[PDB]
Amino acid sequence: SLMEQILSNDNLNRAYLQVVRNKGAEGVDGMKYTELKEYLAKNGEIIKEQLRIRKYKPQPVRRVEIPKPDGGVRNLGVPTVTDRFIQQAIAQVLTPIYEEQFHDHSYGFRPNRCAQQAILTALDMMNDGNDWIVDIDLEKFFDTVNHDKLMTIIGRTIKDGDVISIVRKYLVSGIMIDDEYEDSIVGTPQGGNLSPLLANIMLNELDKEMEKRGLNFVRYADDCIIMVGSEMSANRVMRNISRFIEEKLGLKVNMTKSKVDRPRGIKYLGFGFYYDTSAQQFKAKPHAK
């Protein structure tokens, strides 16, 4: 089934070209993206054999700390360029499968989708009267997700045990989500060939629960806002959805950072919101950083 699709010459050549295009910092092995071509010419068949027999061992991600202007630090986990290549090859096959399942109001790390589309959808909801915002803050997905629960969800769709095996090994390696979009940055995420898709597979369960409740929401990776018509309803939604996230998905809601507010109080994907009194419409613009 899927492993041979992932390892096909066609898919691997596409993954190689993408990873070279994406460049990026070296992982723990010190290998630069400019060395991948020659490395694969020598070792590509060995690597394919190891993957086929479940003996390929991903390298741990390299932890990189980047200063944020507000005095915080952004954490990045950089896979080796070989692992970015394999992750890309996996994602190229898994992405079309899951695109058929995903909700139209999920916008993070998906083909032809971006943060601005989430903003515009949320604005339309706000301007329809749903201007009480439920802003649920989750602890970092890959710091808190239970690997068994995630792999079980993935297993509902993906029956190839060889693919299951290697995806689990990448979770263990420390793959994570580059959150630079929170600073309004646009561009290729570092270390994100596969981890954002895996987060979306899990969080698609939240999308389905919110759709079952008839809620108006947008989501970008693990950052969701829900648009509601009244404070009382927003408080109920906050309580019910936070309970679902913790009990069903096994994720962790930071209740202190989560809040109900009006749009002026919301910071989302680098944007803030304001009421344009000429247009008589909420609009959005980059918030101060």
The footprint of a second copy (CB under 8 A) covers: 21-25, 33, 64, 66, 69, 76, 112, 114-117, 119-120, 123-124, 127-128, 180, 183-188, 190, 270-271, 274, 276, 278-286
Which H or E element spans position 282?
strand 281-286
Question: Which residue's CB is nearer to a second copy, number 126 or number 145?
Answer: 126
Q: Considering the complex, what minimum distance in angstroms separates the CB of residue 28 from a second copy? A: 15
Nearest residue to 43 (alpha-carbon basis) of 28, 27, 31, 26: 31
The DSSP code for 264 is G
Q: Considering the complex, what minimum distance in angstroms separates the CB of residue 113 from a second copy? A: 9
Do the beta carbons of residue 198 and residue 86 sit within 8 Å?
no
Q: Contacting K ion (CB under 5 A), which of 223, 237, 270, 282?
A: 223
Please report, for residues 63, 83, 169, the alpha-carbon distance to residue 79 in angstroms, rounded to integers and kept in the order given: 9, 6, 12
Question: Which residue's CB is nearer to K ion, number 102 or number 217?
Answer: 217
Choosing among a second copy, K ion, none, which partner's interface includes residue 216 (Cβ < 5 to 8 Å by kind)? none
Choosing among a second copy, K ion, none, which partner's interface includes residue 270 (Cβ < 5 to 8 Å by kind)? a second copy
Q: Which of residues 149-188 bind K ion (CB under 5 A)?
A: none
Question: Which residue's CB is nearer to a second copy, number 135 or number 241?
Answer: 135
Burial of 240 (0-12, 13-18, 19+ CB in 10 A): middle
Quick check: 207 binds K ion (CB under 5 A)?
no
**Which amino acid, residue 115?**
A
Please report, for residues 153, 163, 202, 222, the alpha-carbon distance to residue 157 in angstroms, rounded to integers and kept in the order given: 8, 11, 12, 21
HSE-CB of 168 using CA atoms within 13 angstroms: 19
Q: Considering the complex, what minimum distance in angstroms separates the CB of residue 205 from K ion? A: 17
Q: Considering the complex, what minimum distance in angstroms separates the CB of residue 135 from a second copy? A: 18
Q: Give the three-state DSSP class for 160.
A: coil
Question: Which residue's CB is nearer to K ion, number 15 or number 210?
Answer: 210
Q: How far is Cα 284 from Cα 118, in angstroms, rounded to an integer? A: 11
Q: Considering the complex, what minimum distance in angstroms separates the CB of residue 175 from a second copy? A: 16
Q: Considering the complex, what minimum distance in angstroms separates the CB of residue 275 from a second copy? A: 10
Q: Considering the complex, what minimum distance in angstroms separates the CB of residue 225 from K ion? A: 5
61: phi then psi, degrees, rounded to nearest 5: -65, 150
Quick check: 135 binds K ion (CB under 5 A)?
yes
Token pair belonging to 5 = 């699709």
Choosing among K ion, a second copy, none, which partner's interface includes residue 230 (Cβ < 5 to 8 Å by kind)? none
Cβ partners under 8 Å of residue 233, min gap 6:
132
Using the contact rule CB under 5 A, the part of the chain among 127-135, 204-212, 213-221, 241-249 near K ion is 127-135
Q: How far is Cα 48 from Cα 269, in angstroms, rounded to an integer? A: 38
Beta bridge partners of 64: 76
Choosing among K ion, a second copy, none, which partner's interface includes residue 214 (Cβ < 5 to 8 Å by kind)? none
Choosing among a second copy, K ion, none, which partner's interface includes residue 123 (Cβ < 5 to 8 Å by kind)? a second copy
Quick check: 131 binds K ion (CB under 5 A)?
no
Q: Give the three-state DSSP class for 125.
A: helix
Q: Considering the complex, what minimum distance in angstroms separates the CB of residue 21 from K ion? A: 25
Q: Which residues bind K ion (CB under 5 A)?
A: 135, 223
